[PDB]
mmCIF file of C-alpha atoms in Angstrom:
data_model
loop_
_atom_site.group_PDB
_atom_site.id
_atom_site.type_symbol
_atom_site.label_atom_id
_atom_site.label_comp_id
_atom_site.label_asym_id
_atom_site.label_seq_id
_atom_site.Cartn_x
_atom_site.Cartn_y
_atom_site.Cartn_z
ATOM 1 C CA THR F 716 -7.594 10.792 17.956
ATOM 2 C CA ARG F 717 -9.182 10.966 21.607
ATOM 3 C CA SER F 718 -7.303 14.104 23.503
ATOM 4 C CA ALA F 719 -8.862 16.663 26.400
ATOM 5 C CA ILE F 720 -10.740 19.492 25.421
ATOM 6 C CA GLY F 721 -8.453 22.873 24.805
ATOM 7 C CA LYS F 722 -5.855 20.789 22.396
ATOM 8 C CA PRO F 723 -6.003 21.510 19.205
ATOM 9 C CA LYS F 724 -6.389 18.191 17.255
ATOM 10 C CA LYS F 725 -5.853 17.265 13.537
ATOM 11 C CA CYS F 726 -8.800 15.003 12.993
ATOM 12 C CA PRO F 727 -8.080 13.849 9.571
ATOM 13 C CA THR F 728 -10.017 15.470 6.260
ATOM 14 C CA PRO F 729 -13.146 14.063 5.064
ATOM 15 C CA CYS F 730 -11.447 13.115 2.084
ATOM 16 C CA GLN F 731 -8.738 10.779 4.014
ATOM 17 C CA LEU F 732 -11.331 9.145 6.201
ATOM 18 C CA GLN F 733 -13.045 7.746 2.830
ATOM 19 C CA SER F 734 -9.311 6.999 1.530
ATOM 20 C CA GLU F 735 -8.966 4.442 4.076
ATOM 21 C CA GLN F 736 -12.701 3.718 4.068
ATOM 22 C CA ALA F 737 -12.181 2.583 0.390
ATOM 23 C CA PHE F 738 -8.754 1.335 0.683
ATOM 24 C CA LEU F 739 -10.209 -1.219 3.579
ATOM 25 C CA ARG F 740 -12.728 -2.400 1.097
ATOM 26 C CA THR F 741 -10.184 -2.776 -1.802
ATOM 27 C CA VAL F 742 -7.556 -4.773 0.069
ATOM 28 C CA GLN F 743 -10.176 -7.537 0.935
ATOM 29 C CA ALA F 744 -10.890 -8.416 -2.197
ATOM 30 C CA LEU F 745 -7.290 -10.043 -2.096
ATOM 31 C CA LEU F 746 -8.685 -12.449 0.830
ATOM 32 C CA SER F 747 -12.129 -13.127 -1.299
ATOM 33 C CA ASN F 748 -11.761 -14.588 -4.554
ATOM 34 C CA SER F 749 -8.205 -14.228 -4.980
ATOM 35 C CA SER F 750 -8.959 -12.687 -8.414
ATOM 36 C CA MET F 751 -8.317 -9.025 -8.392
ATOM 37 C CA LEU F 752 -5.856 -6.479 -9.837
ATOM 38 C CA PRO F 753 -7.565 -5.504 -12.641
ATOM 39 C CA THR F 754 -6.155 -2.146 -12.681
ATOM 40 C CA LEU F 755 -7.857 -0.738 -15.768
ATOM 41 C CA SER F 756 -10.828 1.321 -14.471
ATOM 42 C CA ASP F 757 -10.817 -0.299 -10.927
ATOM 43 C CA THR F 758 -9.324 -0.107 -7.007
ATOM 44 C CA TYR F 759 -10.180 3.859 -6.865
ATOM 45 C CA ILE F 760 -8.276 5.185 -3.812
ATOM 46 C CA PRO F 761 -8.929 9.334 -3.549
ATOM 47 C CA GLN F 762 -6.233 11.800 -4.190
ATOM 48 C CA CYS F 763 -6.158 15.103 -1.973
ATOM 49 C CA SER F 764 -2.467 16.756 -2.057
ATOM 50 C CA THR F 765 -1.392 18.843 1.005
ATOM 51 C CA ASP F 766 -4.198 20.232 3.493
ATOM 52 C CA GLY F 767 -6.557 17.735 2.849
ATOM 53 C CA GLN F 768 -9.072 18.953 0.539
ATOM 54 C CA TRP F 769 -9.768 17.762 -2.487
ATOM 55 C CA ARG F 770 -7.550 17.504 -5.831
ATOM 56 C CA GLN F 771 -9.979 18.450 -8.912
ATOM 57 C CA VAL F 772 -8.749 15.577 -11.201
ATOM 58 C CA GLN F 773 -9.280 12.302 -9.085
ATOM 59 C CA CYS F 774 -7.871 9.176 -10.401
ATOM 60 C CA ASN F 775 -7.811 5.570 -10.256
ATOM 61 C CA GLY F 776 -5.619 2.431 -10.873
ATOM 62 C CA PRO F 777 -3.280 1.784 -8.298
ATOM 63 C CA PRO F 778 -1.870 3.723 -5.362
ATOM 64 C CA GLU F 779 1.974 5.431 -5.468
ATOM 65 C CA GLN F 780 2.754 2.491 -3.414
ATOM 66 C CA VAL F 781 1.838 0.016 -5.502
ATOM 67 C CA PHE F 782 3.550 0.533 -9.111
ATOM 68 C CA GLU F 783 6.595 1.478 -7.404
ATOM 69 C CA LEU F 784 6.412 -1.498 -5.264
ATOM 70 C CA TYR F 785 4.883 -3.593 -8.716
ATOM 71 C CA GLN F 786 7.758 -2.567 -10.926
ATOM 72 C CA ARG F 787 11.222 -1.806 -8.737
ATOM 73 C CA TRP F 788 11.185 -4.785 -6.043
ATOM 74 C CA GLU F 789 9.711 -7.270 -8.447
ATOM 75 C CA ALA F 790 12.368 -6.662 -10.909
ATOM 76 C CA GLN F 791 16.367 -7.592 -10.116
ATOM 77 C CA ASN F 792 15.545 -11.080 -12.007
ATOM 78 C CA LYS F 793 12.156 -12.050 -9.945
ATOM 79 C CA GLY F 794 9.803 -10.643 -12.828
ATOM 80 C CA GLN F 795 12.198 -9.147 -15.351
ATOM 81 C CA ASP F 796 13.557 -12.350 -16.115
ATOM 82 C CA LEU F 797 10.786 -14.922 -16.287
ATOM 83 C CA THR F 798 7.354 -13.390 -15.203
ATOM 84 C CA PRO F 799 6.219 -9.785 -14.994
ATOM 85 C CA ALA F 800 2.940 -11.444 -15.136
ATOM 86 C CA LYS F 801 0.836 -8.921 -12.895
ATOM 87 C CA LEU F 802 -2.023 -12.043 -12.584
ATOM 88 C CA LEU F 803 1.234 -14.046 -11.054
ATOM 89 C CA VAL F 804 2.714 -11.832 -8.830
ATOM 90 C CA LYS F 805 -0.872 -11.224 -6.885
ATOM 91 C CA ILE F 806 -0.522 -15.132 -6.544
ATOM 92 C CA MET F 807 3.041 -15.190 -5.782
ATOM 93 C CA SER F 808 2.235 -13.800 -2.738
ATOM 94 C CA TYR F 809 -0.126 -16.728 -2.138
ATOM 95 C CA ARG F 810 2.512 -18.767 -1.079
ATOM 96 C CA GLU F 811 3.576 -15.529 1.404
ATOM 97 C CA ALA F 812 -0.156 -15.400 2.411
ATOM 98 C CA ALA F 813 -0.150 -18.479 4.530
ATOM 99 C CA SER F 814 3.153 -18.837 6.142
ATOM 100 C CA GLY F 815 5.108 -16.113 5.219
ATOM 101 C CA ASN F 816 8.119 -15.132 7.127
ATOM 102 C CA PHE F 817 11.256 -15.387 4.635
ATOM 103 C CA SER F 818 14.574 -14.963 7.422
ATOM 104 C CA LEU F 819 16.623 -13.302 4.533
ATOM 105 C CA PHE F 820 18.902 -10.442 5.077
ATOM 106 C CA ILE F 821 18.391 -8.073 2.056
ATOM 107 C CA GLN F 822 15.075 -6.643 1.740
ATOM 108 C CA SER F 823 13.541 -3.125 1.169
ATOM 109 C CA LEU F 824 14.626 -1.360 4.006
ATOM 110 C CA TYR F 825 18.754 0.045 3.599
ATOM 111 C CA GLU F 826 20.671 -3.639 3.923
ATOM 112 C CA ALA F 827 17.594 -4.799 5.900
ATOM 113 C CA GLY F 828 19.633 -4.982 9.307
ATOM 114 C CA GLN F 829 18.612 -8.574 10.125
ATOM 115 C CA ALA F 848 11.132 -7.535 16.725
ATOM 116 C CA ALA F 849 12.085 -4.123 15.545
ATOM 117 C CA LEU F 850 10.216 -0.854 14.034
ATOM 118 C CA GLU F 851 7.386 -0.847 16.339
ATOM 119 C CA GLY F 852 6.541 2.730 15.479
ATOM 120 C CA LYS F 853 8.249 2.924 11.621
ATOM 121 C CA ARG F 854 4.899 3.476 10.141
ATOM 122 C CA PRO F 855 4.626 7.215 10.565
ATOM 123 C CA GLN F 856 8.201 8.486 9.097
ATOM 124 C CA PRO F 857 9.510 6.252 6.635
ATOM 125 C CA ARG F 858 5.317 6.055 5.714
ATOM 126 C CA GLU F 859 5.855 9.660 4.613
ATOM 127 C CA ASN F 860 8.541 7.760 2.439
ATOM 128 C CA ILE F 861 7.875 4.313 1.072
ATOM 129 C CA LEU F 862 4.694 2.957 2.900
ATOM 130 C CA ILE F 871 8.642 -2.999 7.171
ATOM 131 C CA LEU F 872 6.354 -4.331 9.341
ATOM 132 C CA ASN F 873 2.744 -3.783 7.343
ATOM 133 C CA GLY F 874 4.182 -6.326 4.625
ATOM 134 C CA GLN F 875 2.113 -8.404 6.859
ATOM 135 C CA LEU F 876 -0.317 -6.540 7.838
ATOM 136 C CA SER F 877 -1.401 -5.465 4.365
ATOM 137 C CA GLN F 878 -2.212 -9.540 4.319
ATOM 138 C CA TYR F 879 -3.492 -9.808 7.996
ATOM 139 C CA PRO F 880 -6.834 -7.926 9.051
ATOM 140 C CA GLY F 881 -5.505 -4.244 9.681
ATOM 141 C CA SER F 882 -6.916 -0.953 10.648
ATOM 142 C CA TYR F 883 -5.355 1.631 8.912
ATOM 143 C CA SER F 884 -2.627 3.016 6.980
ATOM 144 C CA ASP F 885 -0.662 6.434 7.255
ATOM 145 C CA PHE F 886 -2.537 9.903 6.390
ATOM 146 C CA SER F 887 -0.895 11.259 3.284
ATOM 147 C CA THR F 888 -1.614 11.215 -0.542
ATOM 148 C CA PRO F 889 1.673 12.424 -2.821
ATOM 149 C CA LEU F 890 1.516 13.392 -6.782
ATOM 150 C CA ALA F 891 2.682 10.358 -9.115
ATOM 151 C CA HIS F 892 0.737 9.498 -12.271
ATOM 152 C CA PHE F 893 0.898 6.653 -15.316
#
């Protein structure tokens, strides 16, 4: 967000610039103690619906990308058979945290295709979240400004 004068700019709401300000201060705890994901009363992320104003019932736990990643793509004989194991799912990415680049042909994308997706973090991030999968593990900068509704 840096433009000439006279242009209508959608600077983000004070909620979402606190949301990324708390999202960065939660994913950093993955690389400090490597003993995280309590998901009981922790990892607070703000919730703001459409126009960026504060939704009334601000809640915590996981965001609405996390429990759909922990359920529907830790399943199918990766966590459903052996280890649901939310402590171990945190540290099965510990192998992927060092030299994680596995050249497989089936991923979260539709048939996964196969360098690509240099600007997919705006339109597809309005749906799911796959170049950001290392960027959530590497030191990154910003997620996408969207907070829909889902609950446990």
